[PDB]
mmCIF file of C-alpha atoms in Angstrom:
data_model
loop_
_atom_site.group_PDB
_atom_site.id
_atom_site.type_symbol
_atom_site.label_atom_id
_atom_site.label_comp_id
_atom_site.label_asym_id
_atom_site.label_seq_id
_atom_site.Cartn_x
_atom_site.Cartn_y
_atom_site.Cartn_z
ATOM 1 C CA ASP A 1 15.940 19.003 2.786
ATOM 2 C CA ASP A 2 16.883 15.703 2.312
ATOM 3 C CA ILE A 3 17.570 13.426 -0.155
ATOM 4 C CA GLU A 4 14.162 11.339 0.312
ATOM 5 C CA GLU A 5 12.054 14.295 0.800
ATOM 6 C CA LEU A 6 13.355 16.102 -2.757
ATOM 7 C CA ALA A 7 11.921 13.461 -4.536
ATOM 8 C CA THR A 8 8.481 13.996 -3.019
ATOM 9 C CA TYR A 9 8.774 17.498 -3.855
ATOM 10 C CA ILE A 10 9.569 16.899 -8.112
ATOM 11 C CA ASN A 11 6.536 14.565 -7.914
ATOM 12 C CA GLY A 12 3.884 17.248 -6.544
ATOM 13 C CA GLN A 13 5.742 20.180 -8.512
ATOM 14 C CA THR A 14 4.754 18.106 -11.827
ATOM 15 C CA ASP A 15 3.135 15.004 -13.582
ATOM 16 C CA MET A 16 5.688 14.868 -16.428
ATOM 17 C CA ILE A 17 8.239 13.465 -14.180
ATOM 18 C CA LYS A 18 8.283 10.933 -11.543
ATOM 19 C CA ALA A 19 11.205 10.919 -9.244
ATOM 20 C CA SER A 20 12.522 8.328 -6.134
ATOM 21 C CA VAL A 21 15.207 6.984 -3.820
ATOM 22 C CA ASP A 22 16.378 3.690 -4.297
ATOM 23 C CA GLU A 23 18.821 2.786 -1.653
ATOM 24 C CA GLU A 24 21.518 5.412 -0.654
ATOM 25 C CA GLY A 25 20.207 8.682 -2.696
ATOM 26 C CA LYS A 26 20.172 8.036 -6.082
ATOM 27 C CA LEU A 27 17.155 9.226 -7.765
ATOM 28 C CA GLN A 28 15.207 6.937 -10.351
ATOM 29 C CA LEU A 29 13.863 9.569 -12.804
ATOM 30 C CA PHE A 30 11.040 8.162 -14.635
ATOM 31 C CA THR A 31 9.909 9.462 -18.334
ATOM 32 C CA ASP A 32 6.563 8.247 -19.709
ATOM 33 C CA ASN A 33 6.972 6.881 -22.996
ATOM 34 C CA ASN A 34 3.419 8.005 -24.656
ATOM 35 C CA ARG A 35 3.652 11.587 -24.683
ATOM 36 C CA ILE A 36 7.338 12.297 -23.510
ATOM 37 C CA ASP A 37 9.132 10.753 -26.417
ATOM 38 C CA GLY A 38 12.941 11.895 -26.744
ATOM 39 C CA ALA A 39 15.516 11.944 -24.524
ATOM 40 C CA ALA A 40 15.604 14.556 -21.456
ATOM 41 C CA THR A 41 18.400 16.907 -20.635
ATOM 42 C CA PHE A 42 19.142 17.595 -16.831
ATOM 43 C CA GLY A 43 20.442 20.937 -16.233
ATOM 44 C CA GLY A 44 21.264 22.947 -12.945
ATOM 45 C CA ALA A 45 23.746 22.978 -10.197
ATOM 46 C CA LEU A 46 21.750 20.364 -8.421
ATOM 47 C CA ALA A 47 21.682 17.980 -11.265
ATOM 48 C CA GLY A 48 25.607 18.621 -11.666
ATOM 49 C CA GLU A 49 25.695 17.562 -7.790
ATOM 50 C CA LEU A 50 23.606 14.444 -8.564
ATOM 51 C CA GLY A 51 24.296 11.883 -11.567
ATOM 52 C CA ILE A 52 22.448 12.917 -15.011
ATOM 53 C CA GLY A 53 22.365 9.322 -15.867
ATOM 54 C CA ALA A 54 21.366 7.256 -19.102
ATOM 55 C CA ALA A 55 17.846 6.956 -20.848
ATOM 56 C CA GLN A 56 17.126 3.367 -19.851
ATOM 57 C CA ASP A 57 13.881 2.156 -21.542
ATOM 58 C CA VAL A 58 11.987 -0.384 -18.955
ATOM 59 C CA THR A 59 8.466 -1.942 -19.687
ATOM 60 C CA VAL A 60 6.179 -3.951 -18.126
ATOM 61 C CA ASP A 61 8.279 -6.818 -19.376
ATOM 62 C CA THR A 62 11.598 -6.175 -17.706
ATOM 63 C CA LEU A 63 9.888 -4.881 -14.744
ATOM 64 C CA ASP A 64 11.294 -6.768 -11.629
ATOM 65 C CA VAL A 65 11.193 -5.963 -7.820
ATOM 66 C CA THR A 66 13.815 -7.377 -5.962
ATOM 67 C CA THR A 67 14.930 -4.577 -3.982
ATOM 68 C CA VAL A 68 13.279 -1.474 -3.006
ATOM 69 C CA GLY A 69 14.767 0.653 -5.889
ATOM 70 C CA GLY A 70 13.068 -1.722 -8.661
ATOM 71 C CA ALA A 71 10.147 -1.441 -6.542
ATOM 72 C CA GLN A 72 9.663 2.846 -6.763
ATOM 73 C CA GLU A 73 10.727 2.154 -10.767
ATOM 74 C CA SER A 74 7.941 -0.529 -10.534
ATOM 75 C CA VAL A 75 4.856 1.533 -9.877
ATOM 76 C CA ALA A 76 6.290 4.395 -12.065
ATOM 77 C CA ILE A 77 5.842 2.328 -14.987
ATOM 78 C CA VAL A 78 2.509 0.616 -14.123
ATOM 79 C CA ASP A 79 1.360 3.985 -13.846
ATOM 80 C CA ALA A 80 2.462 5.445 -17.158
ATOM 81 C CA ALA A 81 1.103 1.542 -18.767
ATOM 82 C CA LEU A 82 -2.263 1.925 -16.812
ATOM 83 C CA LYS A 83 -2.808 5.361 -18.768
ATOM 84 C CA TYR A 84 -1.530 3.917 -22.319
ATOM 85 C CA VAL A 85 -4.383 1.042 -21.747
ATOM 86 C CA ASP A 86 -7.283 3.377 -20.462
ATOM 87 C CA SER A 87 -6.395 6.078 -23.502
ATOM 88 C CA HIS A 88 -6.786 2.649 -26.055
ATOM 89 C CA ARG A 89 -9.890 1.693 -24.041
ATOM 90 C CA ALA A 90 -11.229 5.498 -24.653
ATOM 91 C CA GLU A 91 -10.749 5.178 -28.300
ATOM 92 C CA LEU A 92 -12.693 1.724 -28.834
ATOM 93 C CA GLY A 93 -15.245 3.358 -26.611
ATOM 94 C CA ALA A 94 -15.466 6.357 -28.776
ATOM 95 C CA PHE A 95 -15.516 3.587 -31.797
ATOM 96 C CA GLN A 96 -18.636 2.099 -29.807
ATOM 97 C CA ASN A 97 -20.445 5.245 -29.640
ATOM 98 C CA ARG A 98 -19.994 6.496 -33.473
ATOM 99 C CA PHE A 99 -21.427 3.141 -34.472
ATOM 100 C CA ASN A 100 -24.443 3.545 -32.107
ATOM 101 C CA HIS A 101 -25.185 6.615 -33.621
ATOM 102 C CA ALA A 102 -24.450 4.937 -36.954
ATOM 103 C CA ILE A 103 -26.747 1.781 -36.403
ATOM 104 C CA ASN A 104 -29.728 4.023 -35.473
ATOM 105 C CA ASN A 105 -29.267 6.332 -38.588
ATOM 106 C CA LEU A 106 -28.883 3.646 -40.762
ATOM 107 C CA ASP A 107 -31.925 2.756 -39.986
ATOM 108 C CA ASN A 108 -33.615 6.382 -40.693
ATOM 109 C CA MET B 1 -31.521 -6.161 -32.764
ATOM 110 C CA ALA B 2 -32.471 -9.681 -32.138
ATOM 111 C CA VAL B 3 -35.760 -10.291 -29.972
ATOM 112 C CA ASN B 4 -35.014 -14.285 -29.958
ATOM 113 C CA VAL B 5 -34.646 -17.077 -27.776
ATOM 114 C CA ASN B 6 -31.307 -18.791 -28.394
ATOM 115 C CA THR B 7 -29.366 -16.386 -26.653
ATOM 116 C CA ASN B 8 -29.630 -14.126 -23.250
ATOM 117 C CA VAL B 9 -26.884 -11.722 -23.076
ATOM 118 C CA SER B 10 -28.607 -10.211 -20.440
ATOM 119 C CA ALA B 11 -29.160 -13.462 -18.420
ATOM 120 C CA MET B 12 -25.464 -14.149 -19.154
ATOM 121 C CA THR B 13 -24.199 -10.716 -17.820
ATOM 122 C CA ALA B 14 -26.179 -11.157 -14.847
ATOM 123 C CA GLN B 15 -24.654 -14.672 -14.160
ATOM 124 C CA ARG B 16 -20.984 -13.798 -14.803
ATOM 125 C CA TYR B 17 -21.616 -10.344 -12.061
ATOM 126 C CA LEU B 18 -23.650 -13.008 -9.804
ATOM 127 C CA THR B 19 -20.213 -15.300 -10.106
ATOM 128 C CA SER B 20 -18.014 -12.176 -9.045
ATOM 129 C CA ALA B 21 -20.250 -11.384 -6.234
ATOM 130 C CA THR B 22 -20.571 -14.443 -4.187
ATOM 131 C CA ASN B 23 -17.063 -15.142 -5.311
ATOM 132 C CA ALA B 24 -16.414 -12.134 -2.880
ATOM 133 C CA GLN B 25 -19.151 -13.423 -0.662
ATOM 134 C CA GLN B 26 -17.383 -16.964 -0.354
ATOM 135 C CA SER B 27 -13.978 -15.562 0.451
ATOM 136 C CA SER B 28 -15.924 -13.356 3.123
ATOM 137 C CA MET B 29 -17.917 -15.809 5.568
ATOM 138 C CA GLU B 30 -14.433 -17.611 6.200
ATOM 139 C CA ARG B 31 -12.340 -14.289 7.431
ATOM 140 C CA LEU B 32 -14.811 -13.791 9.952
ATOM 141 C CA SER B 33 -15.115 -17.490 11.239
ATOM 142 C CA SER B 34 -11.263 -18.206 11.319
ATOM 143 C CA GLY B 35 -10.345 -14.840 12.790
ATOM 144 C CA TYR B 36 -7.764 -14.103 9.943
ATOM 145 C CA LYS B 37 -7.453 -12.144 6.451
ATOM 146 C CA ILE B 38 -4.941 -14.012 5.332
ATOM 147 C CA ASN B 39 -5.645 -18.074 5.259
ATOM 148 C CA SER B 40 -4.228 -19.193 1.789
ATOM 149 C CA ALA B 41 -1.270 -17.999 0.110
ATOM 150 C CA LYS B 42 -3.669 -16.544 -2.762
ATOM 151 C CA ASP B 43 -5.030 -14.114 -0.937
ATOM 152 C CA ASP B 44 -1.241 -12.345 -0.057
ATOM 153 C CA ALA B 45 1.325 -14.119 -1.184
ATOM 154 C CA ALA B 46 3.875 -11.482 0.383
ATOM 155 C CA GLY B 47 1.593 -11.330 3.436
ATOM 156 C CA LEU B 48 1.852 -14.971 4.325
ATOM 157 C CA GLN B 49 5.557 -14.871 4.302
ATOM 158 C CA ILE B 50 5.970 -12.385 6.189
ATOM 159 C CA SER B 51 2.908 -12.951 8.580
ATOM 160 C CA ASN B 52 4.466 -16.978 9.424
ATOM 161 C CA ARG B 53 7.663 -15.434 10.008
ATOM 162 C CA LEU B 54 6.406 -13.512 13.061
ATOM 163 C CA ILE C 1 15.551 -26.813 47.944
ATOM 164 C CA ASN C 2 11.962 -27.804 48.045
ATOM 165 C CA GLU C 3 10.854 -24.152 48.060
ATOM 166 C CA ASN C 4 12.879 -23.215 44.292
ATOM 167 C CA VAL C 5 11.749 -27.016 42.888
ATOM 168 C CA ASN C 6 8.155 -26.214 43.808
ATOM 169 C CA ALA C 7 8.688 -22.793 41.882
ATOM 170 C CA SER C 8 10.818 -24.888 39.837
ATOM 171 C CA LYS C 9 7.277 -27.130 39.287
ATOM 172 C CA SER C 10 4.978 -23.615 38.203
ATOM 173 C CA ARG C 11 5.083 -22.347 35.162
ATOM 174 C CA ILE C 12 5.585 -25.536 33.933
ATOM 175 C CA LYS C 13 3.238 -27.954 34.759
ATOM 176 C CA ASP C 14 0.670 -25.051 36.776
ATOM 177 C CA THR C 15 -1.293 -22.786 34.641
ATOM 178 C CA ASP C 16 -1.263 -19.093 35.035
ATOM 179 C CA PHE C 17 -4.990 -17.759 35.527
ATOM 180 C CA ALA C 18 -4.049 -14.839 33.389
ATOM 181 C CA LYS C 19 -3.679 -16.219 29.893
ATOM 182 C CA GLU C 20 -5.679 -19.057 30.355
ATOM 183 C CA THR C 21 -8.771 -17.030 31.184
ATOM 184 C CA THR C 22 -8.164 -14.722 28.314
ATOM 185 C CA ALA C 23 -7.597 -17.554 26.211
ATOM 186 C CA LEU C 24 -10.701 -19.275 26.766
ATOM 187 C CA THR C 25 -12.859 -15.970 26.385
ATOM 188 C CA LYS C 26 -10.932 -15.293 23.544
ATOM 189 C CA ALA C 27 -11.843 -18.869 22.230
ATOM 190 C CA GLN C 28 -15.601 -18.131 22.945
ATOM 191 C CA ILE C 29 -15.451 -15.547 20.627
ATOM 192 C CA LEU C 30 -14.797 -17.360 18.087
ATOM 193 C CA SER C 31 -16.834 -19.964 18.838
ATOM 194 C CA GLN C 32 -20.022 -17.880 18.559
ATOM 195 C CA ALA C 33 -18.791 -15.922 15.701
ATOM 196 C CA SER C 34 -18.308 -19.324 13.493
ATOM 197 C CA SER C 35 -21.742 -20.746 14.562
ATOM 198 C CA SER C 36 -23.418 -17.420 13.148
ATOM 199 C CA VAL C 37 -21.315 -17.929 10.164
ATOM 200 C CA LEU C 38 -23.199 -21.130 9.786
ATOM 201 C CA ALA C 39 -26.742 -19.089 10.044
ATOM 202 C CA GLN C 40 -25.558 -17.288 7.054
ATOM 203 C CA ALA C 41 -24.090 -20.026 5.232
ATOM 204 C CA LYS C 42 -26.738 -22.501 5.539
ATOM 205 C CA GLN C 43 -29.183 -19.470 3.556
ATOM 206 C CA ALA C 44 -26.720 -19.798 0.449
ATOM 207 C CA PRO C 45 -28.523 -22.880 -0.889
ATOM 208 C CA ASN C 46 -31.605 -21.280 -0.074
ATOM 209 C CA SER C 47 -30.839 -18.311 -2.137
ATOM 210 C CA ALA C 48 -29.773 -20.151 -5.173
ATOM 211 C CA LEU C 49 -33.670 -21.750 -4.909
ATOM 212 C CA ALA C 50 -35.339 -18.345 -5.122
ATOM 213 C CA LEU C 51 -34.402 -17.609 -8.385
ATOM 214 C CA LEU C 52 -36.941 -20.270 -9.749
ATOM 215 C CA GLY C 53 -40.133 -20.511 -7.503
ATOM 216 C CA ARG D 1 34.824 -4.200 43.280
ATOM 217 C CA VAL D 2 35.557 -7.114 41.751
ATOM 218 C CA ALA D 3 32.140 -8.542 42.757
ATOM 219 C CA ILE D 4 30.656 -5.536 40.930
ATOM 220 C CA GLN D 5 32.970 -5.962 38.029
ATOM 221 C CA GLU D 6 31.730 -9.345 37.574
ATOM 222 C CA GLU D 7 27.832 -7.525 37.649
ATOM 223 C CA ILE D 8 29.208 -5.143 35.379
ATOM 224 C CA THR D 9 30.812 -7.572 33.106
ATOM 225 C CA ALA D 10 27.526 -9.468 33.276
ATOM 226 C CA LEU D 11 25.132 -6.782 32.190
ATOM 227 C CA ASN D 12 27.872 -5.503 29.790
ATOM 228 C CA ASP D 13 26.981 -9.177 27.778
ATOM 229 C CA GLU D 14 23.218 -7.879 28.310
ATOM 230 C CA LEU D 15 23.844 -4.989 26.342
ATOM 231 C CA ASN D 16 25.564 -6.209 23.376
ATOM 232 C CA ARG D 17 23.081 -9.249 23.335
ATOM 233 C CA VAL D 18 19.886 -7.332 23.292
ATOM 234 C CA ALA D 19 21.678 -5.198 20.382
ATOM 235 C CA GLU D 20 21.865 -8.538 18.610
ATOM 236 C CA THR D 21 18.447 -10.260 19.590
ATOM 237 C CA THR D 22 16.198 -7.067 18.609
ATOM 238 C CA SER D 23 15.228 -9.110 15.235
ATOM 239 C CA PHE D 24 11.371 -8.568 14.106
ATOM 240 C CA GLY D 25 11.467 -11.595 11.845
ATOM 241 C CA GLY D 26 15.059 -12.187 11.196
ATOM 242 C CA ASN D 27 16.061 -8.583 10.870
ATOM 243 C CA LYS D 28 18.453 -6.423 13.189
ATOM 244 C CA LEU D 29 16.917 -3.721 14.491
ATOM 245 C CA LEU D 30 20.045 -2.213 16.612
ATOM 246 C CA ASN D 31 22.526 -4.184 15.289
ATOM 247 C CA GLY D 32 23.672 -1.278 12.902
ATOM 248 C CA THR D 33 23.274 -3.525 10.190
ATOM 249 C CA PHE D 34 19.627 -1.480 9.805
ATOM 250 C CA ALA D 35 20.968 0.947 7.554
ATOM 251 C CA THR D 36 18.492 3.949 6.186
ATOM 252 C CA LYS D 37 15.397 2.731 5.105
ATOM 253 C CA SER D 38 12.158 4.228 3.341
ATOM 254 C CA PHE D 39 8.795 3.618 4.256
ATOM 255 C CA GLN D 40 6.546 3.798 1.277
ATOM 256 C CA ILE D 41 3.245 5.697 2.826
ATOM 257 C CA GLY D 42 1.959 7.301 -0.157
ATOM 258 C CA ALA D 43 -0.282 7.146 -3.025
ATOM 259 C CA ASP D 44 2.052 7.432 -5.574
ATOM 260 C CA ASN D 45 5.469 6.912 -5.946
ATOM 261 C CA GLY D 46 8.799 9.041 -4.040
ATOM 262 C CA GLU D 47 6.420 9.891 -1.640
ATOM 263 C CA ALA D 48 8.301 8.128 1.179
ATOM 264 C CA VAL D 49 9.747 8.669 4.746
ATOM 265 C CA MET D 50 13.440 7.212 5.974
ATOM 266 C CA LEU D 51 14.356 6.349 8.904
ATOM 267 C CA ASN D 52 17.676 5.270 10.383
ATOM 268 C CA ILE D 53 18.488 3.089 13.573
ATOM 269 C CA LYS D 54 21.530 3.770 15.297
ATOM 270 C CA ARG E 1 14.985 21.300 24.226
ATOM 271 C CA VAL E 2 17.037 19.484 21.512
ATOM 272 C CA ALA E 3 14.540 16.828 22.139
ATOM 273 C CA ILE E 4 11.822 18.777 21.242
ATOM 274 C CA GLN E 5 13.237 20.800 18.349
ATOM 275 C CA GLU E 6 13.580 16.908 16.848
ATOM 276 C CA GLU E 7 9.912 16.781 17.485
ATOM 277 C CA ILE E 8 9.147 19.831 15.562
ATOM 278 C CA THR E 9 11.481 18.922 13.149
ATOM 279 C CA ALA E 10 9.926 15.746 12.289
ATOM 280 C CA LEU E 11 6.299 17.315 12.603
ATOM 281 C CA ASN E 12 7.428 20.016 10.341
ATOM 282 C CA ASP E 13 8.940 17.337 7.380
ATOM 283 C CA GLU E 14 5.091 15.981 8.063
ATOM 284 C CA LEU E 15 3.314 19.533 7.074
ATOM 285 C CA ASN E 16 5.755 19.751 3.755
ATOM 286 C CA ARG E 17 4.657 16.159 2.867
ATOM 287 C CA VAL E 18 0.828 16.496 3.264
ATOM 288 C CA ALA E 19 1.042 19.619 1.062
ATOM 289 C CA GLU E 20 2.707 17.482 -1.770
ATOM 290 C CA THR E 21 0.727 13.953 -1.143
ATOM 291 C CA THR E 22 -2.799 14.781 -1.262
ATOM 292 C CA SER E 23 -3.618 14.665 -4.465
ATOM 293 C CA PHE E 24 -7.110 13.643 -6.393
ATOM 294 C CA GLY E 25 -5.925 11.498 -8.987
ATOM 295 C CA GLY E 26 -2.632 13.050 -9.825
ATOM 296 C CA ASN E 27 -3.667 16.816 -9.258
ATOM 297 C CA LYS E 28 -1.995 18.666 -6.430
ATOM 298 C CA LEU E 29 -4.630 20.506 -3.852
ATOM 299 C CA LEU E 30 -2.455 21.845 -1.416
ATOM 300 C CA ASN E 31 1.193 22.408 -3.459
ATOM 301 C CA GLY E 32 0.278 25.375 -4.472
ATOM 302 C CA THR E 33 0.370 24.216 -7.748
ATOM 303 C CA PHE E 34 -3.521 24.335 -8.164
ATOM 304 C CA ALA E 35 -4.106 27.781 -9.333
ATOM 305 C CA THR E 36 -7.744 29.063 -9.764
ATOM 306 C CA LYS E 37 -9.800 26.486 -11.840
ATOM 307 C CA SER E 38 -13.661 27.247 -12.846
ATOM 308 C CA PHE E 39 -16.209 24.544 -12.559
ATOM 309 C CA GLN E 40 -19.294 24.638 -14.713
ATOM 310 C CA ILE E 41 -22.225 24.069 -12.471
ATOM 311 C CA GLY E 42 -25.188 25.297 -15.194
ATOM 312 C CA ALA E 43 -26.831 24.669 -17.955
ATOM 313 C CA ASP E 44 -24.970 26.896 -20.615
ATOM 314 C CA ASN E 45 -21.732 28.138 -20.436
ATOM 315 C CA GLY E 46 -19.408 30.810 -19.265
ATOM 316 C CA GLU E 47 -21.153 30.864 -15.725
ATOM 317 C CA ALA E 48 -18.894 28.776 -14.063
ATOM 318 C CA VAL E 49 -17.858 29.445 -10.234
ATOM 319 C CA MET E 50 -13.990 29.866 -9.720
ATOM 320 C CA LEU E 51 -12.131 28.146 -6.607
ATOM 321 C CA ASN E 52 -8.337 28.967 -5.215
ATOM 322 C CA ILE E 53 -6.556 26.239 -2.913
ATOM 323 C CA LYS E 54 -3.842 28.503 -1.361
#
């Protein structure tokens, strides 16, 4: 497998990790903050062959896309943001339904 | 709740979706006449630059 | 010289019927398409009055 | 053979020029400056395909 | 035959890619990571129907 198809393989194997290639073969590993808190430790012969890299914190505010590398990173950040927003939307939704059953209960 | 006359929430909701329905419909009826789906930068800012260069 | 300058006096002044006919045919489609758009665009005020008789 | 060499070196300039003129909007397809360019053809990230033009 | 081989290895990457791209909203249908999933298709519980995608 070449460098780019290896990134697709990792994405398919697990949804816990998002991987991509920027401009020369460097993998941009991603970690969703709302569920994978803590640093990620890398191991295996392939990890040593590549670069382990440091844990850099990125959000939508610092999300910039001027080169293809940041573009593959950005969709990963947005996907985590959308999941967090949707999950919090559900929290308000359950709050509304708990209250709809509260209103008709109080009337009883 | 409130069977009132001063506020019509249902009418307001129909108002908003009517606005969104004919805003996209107004966006159409001009891509067909012009023959282009890119005629203002608001449709696709990135598409405009590359299309003009091409 | 006369032969070659006459060739030069073509594609500079003299039109090829290939791209001109396709341009004319294409322009007819836009003219017919937009004219049909007026048909669906004139009825937009009609739908406005439809809400209240 | 001198006359043929004149035609040969003339067509040689064509080979070099065509490698410098094929652009596609300010790019350079056959110059060799077109490095490995990855085309994102997937819904999610990472599912791209790289293409190299020598 | 070398040229044909470049075509076979090109389509070979397509077979692997499509197996790892077909997702249906974050799942993986053809990667083999989709084990036996039971679909509840009845009023009460337990009488689901299993489905496996190899």
